[model samples]
Target: MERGEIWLVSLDPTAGHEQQGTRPVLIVTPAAFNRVTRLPVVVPVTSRTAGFAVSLDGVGIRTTGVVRCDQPRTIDMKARGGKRLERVPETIMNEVLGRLSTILT
Candidate 1:
């Protein structure tokens, strides 16, 4: 529910090349916004170490997974399931946001 928190989300029925199926996702949207919004922005986590993903070394990830910063998406709060897995550290989350900024600019 909080920003940077990792949760096991049901991302099934994806369209096109979007990250498909149920997987872990990092909550990138701020908790302030999360409290007021029904949809929370998230970044899908993958086992691969490639792409524009940030490594989840000390972010509570047990196995090898990367934060797919380039794959930001929004999911309904009502659809959110499972308990909190972990939270991405502030510095790492900032780096991910920074990369996103560079990509946007």
Candidate 2:
């Protein structure tokens, strides 16, 4: 039998927001998403290869999130919005690029 892998997070994006139900909703950006996809095949999940330990470091704010070390992880778009979270194999790297562009545009 062929086995497959999956990802699981404890909470959804809105749970960490201030307005409860407003804003675009905090979610896993593509760059953050790719950190998991780029993991080395030989490494196990707990060895940093199984997942990514990401932290947003700065003054007055320090937040962190994780991505599976070797798979695509994305936020399911809101029911009302037309956002897309399709799987693109190397999506995590692209995810990070998307977020960085958000600041420029």
Candidate 3:
């Protein structure tokens, strides 16, 4: 559950237009915090390419999907049965983080 890694998580019971269901999420939480944490910040990945989507294709993620940085959320790994899928490169993670910052301010 380290940062820059992709994991499969359940994101059910979502509101309108929210990325729901089981999906690949790129973990953005700091590695140090994950040493003893359940709630880790993550950006959900989707195949649909629209609205602030960032490429996750070939970025160490097997699925050629795009990351929905605009739809970032904190998830409970233990409760959600989160499974580490793969790890994204540092460069790509930095690029995604840069855009994530833009959404804040």
Candidate 4:
């Protein structure tokens, strides 16, 4: 999957308040890396809004949702079945990236 692509992934066996089950996740890792590795970094998206969750309005999503940047995870490509649902717009991706920067440092 390419960066900015949104794919439905299986995130089962989640714990606590983490996003569980199948959900839309933004592919954040670069295309080159994603092409080579089985693991790709992703940020979960949810309809339930909360603190630090970036809005995903008009981001090619059918329903209103928020990018849960705080809940980044590395998912296996095998776990991401089916074709891509959609791709996160550049603007939305930028917002996710900004939030990720804050979390990283």
Residues 1-105, model 3: lDDT tens digits: 688988888898799988789988998889778767778899988773445788876545686778887877987877988888778889888878887888878
Q: For candidate 1, lDDT tens digit of each residue in 1-105? A: 788788887888788998987788888888888878868888888873344778878655563578888888888846656457776678877877876666677
Which candidate order results from sorting by TM-score in descending order? Answer: 3, 4, 1, 2
Worst 10 residues of 3 by lDDT: 48-57
For model 4, how does the per-residue alpha-carbon lDDT over 19-66 read when each residue is reduced to its tens digit?
A: 898778888999889878878998887883356698887546663688
Residue 56, candidate 1: C-alpha displacement in angstroms: 0.8
TM-score of each: 0.84, 0.21, 0.87, 0.86
- What lDDT does the true structure give each of the candidates? 0.77, 0.27, 0.82, 0.79
lDDT of 2 at 82: 22
lDDT by residue (tens digit), candidate 2, 24-101: 212333343434543211101111212132222222222223322232223333233422222222343343334334
Clashing pairs in 3: none
Candidate 2 lDDT trough over 10 residues, lowest sum: 40-49
Task: Choose 2 or 3, whichever is better by TM-score.
Answer: 3
User: Of the candidates shown, which would achieve the greatest lDDT relative to the real structure?
Assistant: 3
Please list all clashing residue pairs in model 2, or write none if there are none: 30-95, 30-96, 31-95, 31-96, 33-92, 34-92, 45-50, 50-69, 51-69
Question: What's the residue-level lDDT of 34 in candidate 4?
Answer: 83
